[PDB]
Amino acid sequence: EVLEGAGPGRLHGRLGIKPDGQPGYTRAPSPPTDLSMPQALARGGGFNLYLSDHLELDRTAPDARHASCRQLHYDLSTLPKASVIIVFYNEPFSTLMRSVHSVLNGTPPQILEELILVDDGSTLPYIREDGNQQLVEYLKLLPAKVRLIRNEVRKGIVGARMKGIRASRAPIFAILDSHIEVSPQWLEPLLLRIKEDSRRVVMPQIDGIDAETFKHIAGGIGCKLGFLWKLMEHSYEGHQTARLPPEERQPSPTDFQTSPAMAGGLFAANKAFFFDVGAYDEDFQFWGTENLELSFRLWQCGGVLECAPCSRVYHIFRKPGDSITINKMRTMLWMDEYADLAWRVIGKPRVNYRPESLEKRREWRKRKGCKSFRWFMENVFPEGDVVTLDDVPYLGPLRNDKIGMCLDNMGWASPGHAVGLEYCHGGDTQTFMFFRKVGHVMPVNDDEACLQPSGRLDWCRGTAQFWWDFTSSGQLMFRETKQCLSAFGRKLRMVECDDTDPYQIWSWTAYNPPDTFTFPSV
């Protein structure tokens, strides 16, 4: 069928009904009262499955859109249809079908070309062809524009996303996850934007669904996402926003904003431009970091990445082999000399990043004319703490020569733990960086953990409570209190600064990286 009794809140008709008037899906009782939340979170793969199975598929959500988003009007006839692609692997029936229902009930059929369901080699009895046919038989109860396609073997996100993209028909495709619910008028703002310029990749903002209670919650994250040298998307910090031009430190919720990085895999894009700009790096293995490789390459090769604060999508906040490291390595091909820093932050890994295929990627980058990563930093993300590698002047052991020991993260680069003094051994547990633009002293393996006068590590904040100065005589001076740290007594205490005190004079290797990153041999 095409449509079956439409209406507001159910734009594609009454979904999932049998030819007898009864829902083709039997909701489950209320979850048991004696429910061990940690064990039920497992059963569901990161969320309360008992509760999900008790909630309706036609679950109505709150309108997360700012008020000024509803005063916008869209002429649905002058908009181009789009193909929504939902990849999934072993996603439970209740959350997958609730995603489909949410889309169909919250998308005008006039602008929705199709809803592509990509089975990435699932093994659950209700998905498989050789199973009980629950999914397949339930789809017959949905509009015909809902299509299912399969992968013999699980290929990962990059592999599954491409399968649906290549299969789509609309000029524009929208990627969503398998555990989502939409706010009203979520697709209209994206289509209007990609219509005026096909080089635009537009991200809907992300709200959340609690893993344990399914309560709808505001994402809170802004629009602009930077990145951490651990190669992870990272929302602009307050001091990073302060570096924006005044006209953009607090823009209206209705206007689109550029973002250096993508929050996940949730976006829309004109199909033709998507392939012209490189699509995905199909040699990325399973899941991880494809979103950064897409953002860097997109900006560098004549594209634009934008958010849409008037396009909200709820997304369950849930509570791999050597693949995740391989992915990061390949991403560094787009980072040029900065790869030297990122390589050390992830621990100078030595894997098989599939070099022969990565070279073919580098010739493509050259043949396309993509800009450099230096341009990327100076033009797309100049608000970062490291815009040029000269902003990392020190990277090495922090040694106090008098006691013959150097600092040690104590196996804990993560924030919250006290730092020790240990005999130097040249390992990554004893190396530290310096970000001069913010006065931060961090272990190389975690640029989110910053040293404090307390002697401990803590989450970095671009403020006075984390600003250090490395003096000409080797003192580590906390700028706020004008005190210098000492190794006296194999203990880290703050004292009065005196270049004569040998316990407060330190050595810090200078970070003078090469102008070109040479990938490690395999």
Numbering used by the authors: 100 to 418, 426 to 628
Quote the paper.
To examine the role of Mn2+N in catalysis, we first verified its presence by solving the x-ray crystal structure of apo TxgGalNAc-T3 in the absence of Mn2+ to 2.9 Å resolution and did not observe density for Mn2+N. We initially hypothesized that Mn2+N was aligning the sidechains for GalNAc binding. However, a comparison of the substrate-bound structure and apo structure shows that the Mn2+N binding residues adopt similar conformations in both structures, indicating that Mn2+N uses an alternate mechanism to influence activity.
O-glycosylation of the protein CST1 by the mucin-type O-glycosyltransferase T. gondii (Txg) GalNAc-T3 influences cyst wall rigidity and stability. The structures reveal a unique GalNAc binding pocket that dictates the substrate preference of TxgGalNAc-T3, which is coupled to a 2nd metal binding site that is strictly conserved among apicomplexan homologs.
